[PDB]
Design a protein around this ligand. Structure first.
Ligand code: HEC
Ligand code: HEC
Lengths: 523, 523
């Protein structure tokens, strides 16, 4: 047969199915399963037909400097395949494929069997103080030694590399990409080495390890945007064990939703459970892995379009926000119930938040507001500060909007606030630091990008991350003009510049994950 | 001879000079005379050699959707010329050319001699209520009828079309592009028609007409980034009459600066003079055109890196800011002196500002702050409010940072504030409106982008512009996803939606210039 779309170059039924398979294996992680866009732009026929075949071939062939791979000049895709892809994205988007146990098992690779792995750490690295750094546009992670401020390893994962997580033993580093590829890295090998890989879906954002006491390295979980599902895997091998669909009913209208994406997963410390946020249906699932054949799930209704979330300081209450809402949902992971919906007056910015002790209000959890740069504080201690629990107690004011990350550490007296997307260049190039011992005082500004010494041009600073001791804070810096990058390290006790990590291998550093602080949910 | 650069494909001395001529005629308006970038990205060899010949050819050939023309697929440039350009931008940037009276006169075209033009308005348009709208990526302006809300004419100018200005008679519309091309349009023709064109430099931003009483249509002035100069032309024909270099000594170090760009030009109402801001040397020039053969210029030292500025409500004091400064310079255009340097505590955002009467402080001029969305008010009435003159008297707070334009009108009780570059989508898609009769009250938010009804996707709203009566406010809206655009019209007395202008010819509408309000400096 012939596939035809108004205004599109007709294709063979075989050409279309070949392009379909390429699209969902290689493109959908960034462009979406219905091509509506995510990290990458929309590729629906209204837009692509306006660009035309030859423009589309050119873009796919050479890529762009802002994260679109050069599929042709890389050799990843053939001239003929690129022509097929340029034709394909001008046709109506088809139904995306499913991805079950057969597809997962076919993608599963064990490079080093558990019995062939070392019995102890064979390298001499200070593993808890390693930083795993995403090299966004290079499809790699870099392992950076926190003590010597040197790159010690670079590891290929794939385009669309996203985040790193740690197993509860501290031995295994887990990386997931937006195409739902997972890599498992053994930090005890003579040089840290990939030991297993698997693909759990077409599009994904989240991975996590089992962190309840006694379950170290037992299970790894991953959540997909498409298909709407999460998968529980063997923590030692990534062998897929259980797959659970998240298709289902919405919390607000109780009508069936055909694509409830998994937004985020964190690991419970109160029970052997994973906390799974399901976005469109607005459900927080507590998934119990004490028995994975007789699988227990508690579904807590929260609010539609759930985003990220994070633990409070006690690791009991899960603080989460939904888009289009001024409320923070508080899930009690111990009693397995919704505890509160906290009005913070403004829309909270998705993220783990930042926990610290307010001298007056006691333990608080904090969230930023993207538009105006304010930060809301919520009391999180029903035991000793019941008069403040699940209430907004205060508001701090940063330099302005555009913050992506706020960060503290239990051993630090400072709160760091970036302003990556602020439209003023001096503010996007700097970070605000609040004194937790005098929260009535204005923040101080650290000139992070200037310290990086990267030449003239637009520089953006992102994501404060502490070292294992809590006495250094690391920042990613990148000059959009010349492709140049650095990690800037501040002494948290003095607020002085301590080090600048520069290396040609440090390509578009974005997320930085300190091993200890990621393993132990320290924020 | 052979031109060679480390890492660049060698070129014929003739090929290089051919590419040089193309670069400075067609590319430098956006990419800069030393290729350091302006509207378009930097094209210095460090960056271009990393991209490589074939990527560079592809980009030049097909362009990009964010304002880089498709030189090859347009037919503007040959395959051979595009190869030469891709080689050329990998070589060391050469010295840019000069552009004097011979070059200006060679570019000068009179399409309709003044004696052949109509003696009165032959079309039936309400000319004072026309809006001249920049169609940024189309190289055109659209004339939109303020009464019927319909496009009535579309006029080609060139890529990099920038702003519109009006002659003091109300008859001639002046358009300048970033390549320093000027078009003069006769609004009295049966259909408004280009009557003259000229090129006054390689790179430019500003054009203005003579507005002192009695000099209607006598002179047009334009200022260039490169060469560092301004040119005075005959107001009826654009014939070049006088060219003045702005090369000279800096205000702060009194050392010679070889490229002092003309930042902005406005027209004096106190004297037959143009006010010319010279950026790097920090000089405000009062250029007197009573006698242009015996040319008098008063040079007022202000501050380095002068930007835009605007008149106060009385059209006597020129309010201007320099980058990297918390001060607003006040130039008295009547007495021809610096009046004050007003500390507003934060960096003012370049712009004309907004004038209104504060019930307590009297006439004030207002400026926004890009980072945090605040607005500073300065008293501008030494006669009746001397206790507030040249002092910051108050601060308003908008939705957040990212404002590009604030706007009022003497017949309006509202102040409008866009937030085009705010990182929160709801804020960038809306505008704040303050009640000038109750400035203690919080602003109201108008959902401008939602009213435009442009489908899902990132939409940005920019530049409130009033109609001639002051009772409508117009906004440009554009959906980045689908290329779709609208002008949204609000009833200023009710703050209700009044009209939505949609037309496939409305491609990337940016600046909107109401004829009457531009002619009479009404802001
Ligand atoms: C994330 C790592 C991506 C993957 C994998 C793919 N694409 Fe992509 N693409 C991505 C981005 C961030 C962008 C925008 C970059 C820009 O500079 O703004 C793009 C762009 C495209 C386009 C152009 C869209 C347009 O001009 O409107 C096309 C045609 C495109 N991408 C296609 C495409 C294909 C077919 C891919 C699989 C082979 C693919 N992309 C992968 C990000 C990412
Ligand atoms: C303004 C109207 C422009 C004119 C005239 C020219 N260019 Fe341009 N260019 C412009 C922009 C806004 C951009 C960036 C667009 C993007 O999508 O972000 C560009 C880009 C380029 C590039 C690519 C740079 C890179 O990938 O780093 C090149 C090689 C380039 N432009 C070359 C070029 C030439 C040779 C031109 C004259 C023939 C030219 N541009 C004109 C804006 C504008």
């Amino acid at each position: 047969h012939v596939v035809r779309t108004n205004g599109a170059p007709d294709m063979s039924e075989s050409e279309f199915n070949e392009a379909k398979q390429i699209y969902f294996q290689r493109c959908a992680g960034c462009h979406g399963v219905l091509r509506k866009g995510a990290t990458g732009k929309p590729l629906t026929p209204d837009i692509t037909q306006q660009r035309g075949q030859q423009y589309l071939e050119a873009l796919i062939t050479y890529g762009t400097p802002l994260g679109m791979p050069n599929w042709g000049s890389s050799g990843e895709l053939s001239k003929e395949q690129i022509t097929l892809m340029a034709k394909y994205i001008q046709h109506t988007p088809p139904q995306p494929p499913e991805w079950g146990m057969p597809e997962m098992r076919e993608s599963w690779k064990v490079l080093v069997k558990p019995e062939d792995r070392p019995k102890k750490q064979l390298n001499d690295l200070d593993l808890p103080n390693l930083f795993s750094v995403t090299l966004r546009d290079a499809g790699q992670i870099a392992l950076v030694d926190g003590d010597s401020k040197k790159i010690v390893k670079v590891i290929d994962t794939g385009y669309a590399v996203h985040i790193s997580r740690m197993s509860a033993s501290g031995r295994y580093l887990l990386v997931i990409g937006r195409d739902a590829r997972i890599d498992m890295i053994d930090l005890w090998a003579k040089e840290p080495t990939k030991v297993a890989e698997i693909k759990i879906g077409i599009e994904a954002r989240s991975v996590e390890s089992s962190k309840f006491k006694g379950y170290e390295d037992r299970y790894t979980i991953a959540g997909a945007y498409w298909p709407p599902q999460f998968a529980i895997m063997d923590g030692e091998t990534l062998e897929p064990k259980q797959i659970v669909s998240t298709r289902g009913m919405t919390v607000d209208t109780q009508t069936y939703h055909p694509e409830p994406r998994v937004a985020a997963i964190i690991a419970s410390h109160e029970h052997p459970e994973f906390i799974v946020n399901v976005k469109e249906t607005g459900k927080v699932l507590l998934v119990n892995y004490k028995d994975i054949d007789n699988l227990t799930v508690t579904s807590i209704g929260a609010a539609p379009f759930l985003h990220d979330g994070g633990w409070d300081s006690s690791h009991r209450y899960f603080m989460t926000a939904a888009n289009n809402s001024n409320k923070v949902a508080v899930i009690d992971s111990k009693d397995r119930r919704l505890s509160a919906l906290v009005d913070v007056g403004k829309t909270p910015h998705p993220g783990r938040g930042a926990n610290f002790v307010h001298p007056k209000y006691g333990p608080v959890w904090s969230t930023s507001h993207l538009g105006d740069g304010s930060i809301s504080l919520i009391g999180t201690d029903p035991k000793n500060h019941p008069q403040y629990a699940w209430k907004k107690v205060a508001e701090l004011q940063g330099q302005g909007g555009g913050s992506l990350f706020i960060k503290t550490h239990p051993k630090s007296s400072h709160l760091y606030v970036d302003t990556t997307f602020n439209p003023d260049a001096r503010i996007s190039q700097s970070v605000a630091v609040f004194d937790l011992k005098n929260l009535d005082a204005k923040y101080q500004v650290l000139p992070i990008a200037e310290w990086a010494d990267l030449g003239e041009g637009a520089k953006r600073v992102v994501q404060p991350e502490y070292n294992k001791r809590g006495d250094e804070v690391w920042f990613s810096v990148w000059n959009g003009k010349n492709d140049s990058s650095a990690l800037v390290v501040v002494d948290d006790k003095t607020l002085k510049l301590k080090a600048v990590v520069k290396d040609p291998r440090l390509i578009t550093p974005t997320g930085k994950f300190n091993v200890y602080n990621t393993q132990h949910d320290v924020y």
